[PDB]
């Protein structure tokens, strides 16, 4: 019996990889898949140190100690209290209070940069421990949040908010699968094979 | 403009109160609803100290510094890797690895007690920071978890697990709304009124 230690972003684990995790479990009954979640920085360190076999992390891929594959396109949605007018540019919500998922620095920085590009700013940023909590604050009328569409639409509360994608250069991010630079192990190759049988559906129309 | 500081369990915030939060936001535009999440013990302390106006917490209600209302019935589901035979008693899964939501001690203790009642035990308990992460470990074949049906069925991964309710005396728990003992404030009375227009649907068939 072997061990495949896979790290993942919270959002990816929630709405992108469940089907692949089940398939891998059933395909390789003698491999123990150990799934952990955390921030990209921490996971990358775990992959580099050998504590993780691979991890789903925020792009872009820049660390020379890693190799990787771009896997999931995420559509970044600005989320507001119910019935709010479509938000198409940051000046329209200048000074608004913002709620961010603490563990995903890349999404927070992206949201901030979107404000700054239109010479606007959030009034303040509140770091939150969960997507459900973040969404509940928006539902309650407290401010705005930036959440991938895939994650947003999986949460019941999406019925109680209004959401729109960010404008083109800010609309899409990419979640990568990364591993330690070098020949892939048989287990990782096996995992990528099962994963690929799905990401054709995710990227294709 | 006033402030209503409401604490809530993660699960309750995810799948029980979104509609009520939106209604309260729209009904009282001059009240700022500040929604926080955390473990019951911490929230109760916040209510007692005056940091929170009220909180949704795990029952039963025993602290004499509080008054409260029983609100949501939660059906406790044992969750296993896909296709697993129905689990009706703990001896059937004696020694299994268990995944628990770190913040909800009451649900962890409940699960442990369910094992012990049948002279069984989990092999070990792994504390997890999120329901999605907990569910992903089960999907991956790593063990079992105890999750309220309302929460479970809201997560996409529920399609990749098999789940059954615990047997009668272990099947149902109750989430309470609690506040500091004394006359309720006008805001709390107002919140309870909007809440009551919904919990008839939650409890009734
Ligand atoms: Cl994330
Ligand atoms: Cl990228
Ligand atoms: Cl909870
Ligand atoms: Cl109770
Ligand atoms: Na396994
Ligand atoms: Na408000
Ligand atoms: Na859902």
Task: Find out whether A124 and A98 touch, Cβ atoms under 8 Å.
Answer: yes
Q: Is the alpha carbon torsion for A124, A126, A131, A136 positive or negative?
A: negative
Residue A86 CB partners (closer than 8 Å, separation 6+): A162, A164
Tokens 């916040």 label which residue? Answer: B46
Rounded-to-integer distance, Cα A136 and Cα A161, Å = 9
Rounded-to-integer distance, Cα B189 and Cα B16, Å = 19
Bridge partners, B5 (sequence order): B34
Chain A residue numbers touching B25 (CB-CB < 8 A): 81-82, 139-141
Q: Tokens for B78?
A: 């044992």
Rounded-to-integer distance, Cα A77 and Cα A145, Å = 8
Angle between helices A40-49 and A105-117 (to 10 degrees): 140
DSSP state of A155: S
Q: Which residue of A has its CA nearest to B158?
A: A18
Q: Tokens for B197?
A: 């227009």
Rounded-to-integer distance, Cα A123 and Cα A97, Å = 5
Q: Tokens for A186?
A: 């048989």
Of B93, B73, B89, B87, the closest CA to residue B176 belongs to B73
CB contact under 8 A, A139 and B37: no
- How much helix, strand and coil, in percent to the nearest 5, is found in chain A? 40, 30, 30
Question: In whole angstroms, how far apart are CA A163 and each of A191, B18, B94?
Answer: 34, 15, 46
Task: Find out whether B59 and B70 touch, Cβ atoms under 8 Å.
Answer: yes
Task: Find out whether A177 and A121 touch, Cβ atoms under 8 Å.
Answer: no
Ligand that lies nearest to the alpha carbon of residue A158, given by its number in the listed order: 7
Chain B residue numbers touching A18 (CB-CB < 8 A): 135-136, 139, 156-157, 159-160
Rounded-to-integer distance, Cα A82 and Cα B25, Å = 10
Of B9, B1, B33, B2, the closest CA to residue B194 belongs to B33
CB contact under 8 A, A140 and B15: no
Bridge partners, A173 (sequence order): A74
Q: Tokens for B116?
A: 């012990």
Q: Where exactly does CATH 3.40.190.10 map onto chain A?
A: 2-72+173-203, 74-172
Chain B residue numbers touching A36 (CB-CB < 8 A): 133
Q: Which residue of B has its CA nearest to A139?
A: B22
Architecture of domain B2-72+173-203: 3-Layer(aba) Sandwich (3.40)
Report the relative pairing of strands A144-148 and A66-81 from DSSP bridges. antiparallel
Rounded-to-integer distance, Cα B78 and Cα B36, Å = 27
Tokens 């409401």 label which residue? Answer: B6
Q: Is B95 helix (H, G, I), strand (E, B) or coil?
A: coil
Mutate to test the interface with A, among B8, B10, B12, B13 (most CBs of A within 10 A): B13
DSSP state of B159: G
Residue B10 CB partners (closer than 8 Å, separation 6+): A130, A132, A133, B37, B101, B103, B104, B131
Rounded-to-integer distance, Cα B68 and Cα A151, Å = 34
Chain A residue numbers touching B13 (CB-CB < 8 A): 132-133, 136
* Residue B128 Cα to chain centre, angstroms: 15
DSSP state of B129: S
Cα-only R_g, chain A: 18
Rounded-to-integer distance, Cα B36 and Cα A126, Å = 11
Of B48, B59, B50, B51, the closest CA to residue B9 belongs to B59
Residue A134 CB partners (closer than 8 Å, separation 6+): A99, A100, A101, A128, A145, A147
Q: Which residue of A has its CA nearest to B135?
A: A14
Please count the residues of chain A: 205
Q: How many CB atoms lie within 10 A of CB A28?
A: 18
Helix (H) or strand (E) holding A184: none
* Residue B109 Cα to chain centre, angstroms: 13
**How buried is A3 (Cβ within 10 angstroms: 0-12 exposed, 13-18 middle, 19+ buried)?**
exposed
Report the relative pairing of strands B97-101 and B124-128 from DSSP bridges. parallel
Task: Find out whether B117 and B90 touch, Cβ atoms under 8 Å.
Answer: yes
Beta strand residue intervals within A38-158, DSSP E: 54-58, 66-81, 97-101, 124-128, 144-148
Q: Tokens for A31?
A: 């491999």
- Can you identify the CATH homologous superfamily of domain A74-172? Periplasmic binding protein-like II (3.40.190.10)
CB contact under 8 A, A136 and B24: no
> From ligand 3's centre to the CA of B155, what distance in Å?
14
Rounded-to-integer distance, Cα A174 and Cα A154, Å = 19
Q: Is B203 helix (H, G, I), strand (E, B) or coil?
A: helix
Rounded-to-integer distance, Cα A47 and Cα A53, Å = 6
Of A24, A9, A19, A93, the closest CA to residue A58 belongs to A9
Q: Is the alpha carbon torsion for A200, A59, A42, A10 positive or negative?
A: negative
* Residue B50 Cα to chain centre, angstroms: 23
Rounded-to-integer distance, Cα B75 and Cα A26, Å = 28
Bridge partners, B147 (sequence order): B77
Q: How far is the first Cα of chain A from the last one, in angstroms, to the nearest whole number?
A: 39
Q: How far is the first Cα of chain B from the last one, in angstroms, to the nearest whole number?
A: 39
CB contact under 8 A, B140 and A25: yes
């Amino acid at each position: 019996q072997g061990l495949f230690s896979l790290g993942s972003l919270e959002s990816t684990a929630a709405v992108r990889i469940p089907s692949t995790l089940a398939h891998f479990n059933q395909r390789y009954p003698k491999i123990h898949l150990a799934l952990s979640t955390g921030p990209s920085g921490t996971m990358i360190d775990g992959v580099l140190e050998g504590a993780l076999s691979a991890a789903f992390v925020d792009g872009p891929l820049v660390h020379p100690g890693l190799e990787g594959l771009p896997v999931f396109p995420e559509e970044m949605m600005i989320v507001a209290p119910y019935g709010h007018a479509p938000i198409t540019r940051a000046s329209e919500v200048n000074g608004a209070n913002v709620y961010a998922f603490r563990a995903n620095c890349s999404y927070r920085r992206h949201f901030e940069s979107w404000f700054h590009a239109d010479r606007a700013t959030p009034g303040r940023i509140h770091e939150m421990e969960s997507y459900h909590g973040m969404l509940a604050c928006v539902i309650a009328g407290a401010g705005l949040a930036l959440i991938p569409r895939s994650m947003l639409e999986s949460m019941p509360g999406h019925q109680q908010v209004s959401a729109w994608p960010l404008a083109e250069e800010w609309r899409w991010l990419t979640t990568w699968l990364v591993w330690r630079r070098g020949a892939k192990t048989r287990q990782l190759e096996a995992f990528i094979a099962l994963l690929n049988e799905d990401r054709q559906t995710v990227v294709s129309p």
